[PDB]
């Protein structure tokens, strides 16, 4: 394969596919079509009033926060930790996590993932994939 | 295992170990001691008048340029390509590459690498590991 270089703005931002995510887009910067065969690099952005359903999975995250701030929701620690620019975050396999932003709050961050990514498990189970945002158990993690 | 969060400034910048590198430091942000067992995240900074010996190795790079600019030296393409902020770069296994900065030029960039990193091979072989900087074959890459 060949050396690839791409600027972030030349990768189209698409809405994330995870059901029940709000105001969250991503740009796949380096992926398996580029010859990456073990890990990949994706940029995410959570716009104001955004969230993803807290989940857990058998693939680790390494995260680097580029711009803005957001809440890292940590259901097994009963809390949400604010993260900001210049922070690296490792989330091991199995550890529940989700993202959130309030009004006026935007966050752009890199996620490094493996090529093989088994399906995620939701912390809050429901037919409606948005129901987590109205559950007391979730809202209490936000403080 | 456990979730780790670290701001870049809480990881001490150290000179890179590669012989013949100049003005190049790194901060290991997420590494194997943190429970990372497939890939790791390192921030590098090349300060002005800096360079690394062009090399090749059996491990791919995924790189994201955070601040400033530098030359990606590409020996198999007979050229040096200027890179800047917001750029993702993929460098396959075996492709030669090095970094360089001129007098007013500093660059801070993330490198994602595997845990297993066999020894690199220098493009320019010499006993003095700085000898590349004065070789015509190298300086003509810089164009
Ligand atoms: Zn996840
Ligand atoms: Zn290298």
UniProtKB/TrEMBL annotation, chains A, B:
Family annotation (InterPro entries): Cupin_2, QDO-like, RmlC-like_jellyroll, RmlC_Cupin_sf
All residue ranges annotated as the Cupin type-2 domain in the record: 44-112
Keywords: Kinase, Metal-binding, Transferase, Zinc
Coiled-coil annotated spans: none
GO MF annotations, alphabetized: kinase activity; metal ion binding
Residues that hold Zn(2+) according to the record: 55, 57, 61, 97
UniProt cross-references to Pfam families, sorted A to Z: Cupin_2
PANTHER family from the UniProt entry: PUTATIVE (AFU_ORTHOLOGUE AFUA_8G07350)-RELATED
Name the record gives this protein: Cupin 2 conserved barrel domain protein
Protein source organism: Streptomyces resistomycificus
């Amino acid at each position: 394969s060949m050396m690839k270089r791409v600027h972030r703005t030349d990768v189209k931002a698409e809405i994330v596919r995870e059901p029940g995510a709000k105001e969250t887009t991503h740009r796949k910067l380096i992926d398996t079509p580029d010859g990456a065969d073990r890990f990949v690099l994706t940029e995410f952005e959570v716009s104001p009033n955004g969230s993803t359903p807290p989940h857990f999975h058998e693939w680790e995250h390494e995260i680097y926060v580029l711009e803005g701030s957001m809440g890292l929701v940590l259901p097994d620690q009963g809390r949400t930790e604010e993260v900001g620019p210049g922070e690296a975050i490792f989330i091991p396999r199995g550890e529940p996590h989700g993202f959130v932003t309030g009004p006026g709050q935007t966050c752009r961050f890199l996620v490094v993932a493996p090529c093989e990514r088994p399906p995620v498990r939701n912390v809050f189970l429901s037919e409606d994939p948005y129901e987590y945002t109205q559950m007391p158990e979730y809202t209490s993690l936000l403080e």
